UniProtKB/Swiss-Prot annotation, chain A:
Knockout mutant characteristics: Mice display normal synapse formation but abnormal synaptic vesicle maturation and die shortly after birth. Heterozygotes exhibit impaired insulin secretion and abnormal glucose tolerance.
Protein name: Protein unc-13 homolog A
Record gene name: Unc13a
Its biological purpose: Plays a role in vesicle maturation during exocytosis as a target of the diacylglycerol second messenger pathway. Involved in neurotransmitter release by acting in synaptic vesicle priming prior to vesicle fusion and participates in the activity-dependent refilling of readily releasable vesicle pool (RRP). Essential for synaptic vesicle maturation in most excitatory/glutamatergic but not inhibitory/GABA-mediated synapses. Facilitates neuronal dense core vesicles fusion as well as controls the location and efficiency of their synaptic release.
Residues of the whole record sequence present: 1536 to 1624 of 1712
Subunit structure: Interacts with the N-termini of STX1A and/or STX1B1 and DOC2A. Interacts with BSN. Interacts with RIMS1 which recruits UNC13A to the active zone. Forms homodimers via its first C2 domain. Also interacts via this domain with the zinc finger domain of RIMS2. Part of a complex consisting of ERC2, RIMS1 and UNC13A. Also part of a complex consisting of UNC13A, RIMS2 and RAB3A. Interacts with FBXO45 (via SRY domain); leading to the degradation of UNC13A by the proteasome.
Domain C2: from-to ranges: 1-89
UniProt comment concerning the protein's domains: The C2 domains are not involved in calcium-dependent phospholipid binding. The C-terminal region containing both MHD domains and the third C2 domain is required for synaptic vesicle priming activity.
Domain of life: Eukaryota
Subcellular location: Cytoplasm; Cell membrane; Presynaptic cell membrane; Presynaptic active zone
Curated annotation (Swiss-Prot), chains B, C:
Name recorded for this polypeptide: Protein unc-13 homolog A
Location of this fragment in the whole protein: 1143 to 1231 of 1735
Gene this chain is encoded by: Unc13a
Quaternary state and interactors: Interacts with the N-termini of STX1A and/or STX1B1 and DOC2A. Interacts with BSN. Interacts with RIMS1 which recruits UNC13A to the active zone. Forms homodimers via its first C2 domain. Also interacts via this domain with the zinc finger domain of RIMS2. Part of a complex consisting of ERC2, RIMS1 and UNC13A. Also part of a complex consisting of UNC13A, RIMS2 and RAB3A. Interacts with FBXO45 (via SRY domain); leading to the degradation of UNC13A by the proteasome.
Phylogenetic classification of the source organism: Eukaryota, Metazoa, Chordata, Craniata, Vertebrata
Source species: Rattus norvegicus (Rat)
Function: Plays a role in vesicle maturation during exocytosis as a target of the diacylglycerol second messenger pathway. Involved in neurotransmitter release by acting in synaptic vesicle priming prior to vesicle fusion and participates in the activity-dependent refilling of readily releasable vesicle pool (RRP). Essential for synaptic vesicle maturation in most excitatory/glutamatergic but not inhibitory/GABA-mediated synapses. Facilitates neuronal dense core vesicles fusion as well as controls the location and efficiency of their synaptic release.
Domain of life: Eukaryota
């Protein structure tokens, strides 16, 4: 229904040996959503995996008006657990 | 970085070239169908200038976005065979 | 106190943070203009010691006073996001 360009950097966090996940949301494209109104796309990013109760599971880009190919260039930083490896997420 | 293959233009891109070409084709069709969408939106909107300084209407932005997405994929391949690159280009 | 948001570091400080930074900016520039004024008032006072046992001159005091008035305006926000705090700091 479209696509999202992301650049993602796993950091086995050079400051801690936890894992942190930088997610640069670059853009979306080909969004199948030529809507009955003002389209205002934004991109939610969520991390999924174990031990996330204490952590910010969700981010979102700003919205972009009337844009089926919205650029964002917005960089988020999830924390994973320390224990569960990146393959648990 | 092994001497044995720093001594060569890498041969592996020649394996993938037919697939990248097929992808470039698919991408052209997707681009030309996206274009008609982008234009039909803009035309139905009566070609509003994107803003009072973006003197052009939105379909330009859509189209170049599509093209740029398309280009950036190719560019990220960084194909080390300049003849395969010339062919892609 | 709703469980849903007791579960979380409040996200609202991310909203205000740019306006706080703007404030910190207005504040610094005011503080640097103030600094020059204070130094110059003290210079006009020939840089007398604040007393014969308070061996520095008054501009030092004025500046720390200002910096503290300023810091306290920040501190009075008690932003529950410590990274947004870290940014202010």
């Amino acid at each position: 229904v479209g696509e999202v360009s992301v650049h993602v950097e796993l950091f086995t966090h050079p400051g801690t040996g936890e894992q942190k996940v930088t997610v640069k949301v670059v853009a979306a494209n080909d969004l199948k959503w030529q809507t009955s109104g003002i389209f205002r796309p934004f991109i939610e990013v969520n991390i999924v995996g174990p031990q996330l109760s204490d952590k910010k599971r969700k981010f979102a880009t700003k919205s972009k008006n009337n844009s089926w190919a919205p650029k964002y260039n917005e960089s988020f930083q999830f924390s994973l657990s320390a224990d569960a490896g990146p393959e648990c997420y | 970085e092994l001497p044995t293959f720093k001594d060569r233009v890498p041969e592996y891109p020649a394996w993938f070239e037919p697939f990248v070409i097929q992808w470039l084709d698919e991408n052209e069709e997707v681009s030309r169908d996206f274009l008609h969408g982008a234009l039909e939106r803009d035309k139905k909107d009566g070609f509003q200038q994107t803003s009072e300084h973006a003197l052009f209407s939105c379909s330009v932005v859509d189209v170049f976005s599509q093209l740029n997405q398309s280009f950036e994929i190719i560019k990220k391949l960084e194909c080390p065979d300049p003849q395969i690159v010339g062919h892609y280009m």
